[PDB]
Design a protein around this ligand. Structure first.
Ligand SMILES: [Cu+2]
Ligand code: NA
Ligand code: NA
Length: 10
């Protein structure tokens, strides 16, 4: 990250 920080959704 994003809205799943820390990822892997990115
Ligand atoms: Cu992330
Ligand atoms: Na960031
Ligand atoms: Na990813």
């Amino acid at each position: 990250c994003g809205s799943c920080y820390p990822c892997s959704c990115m």
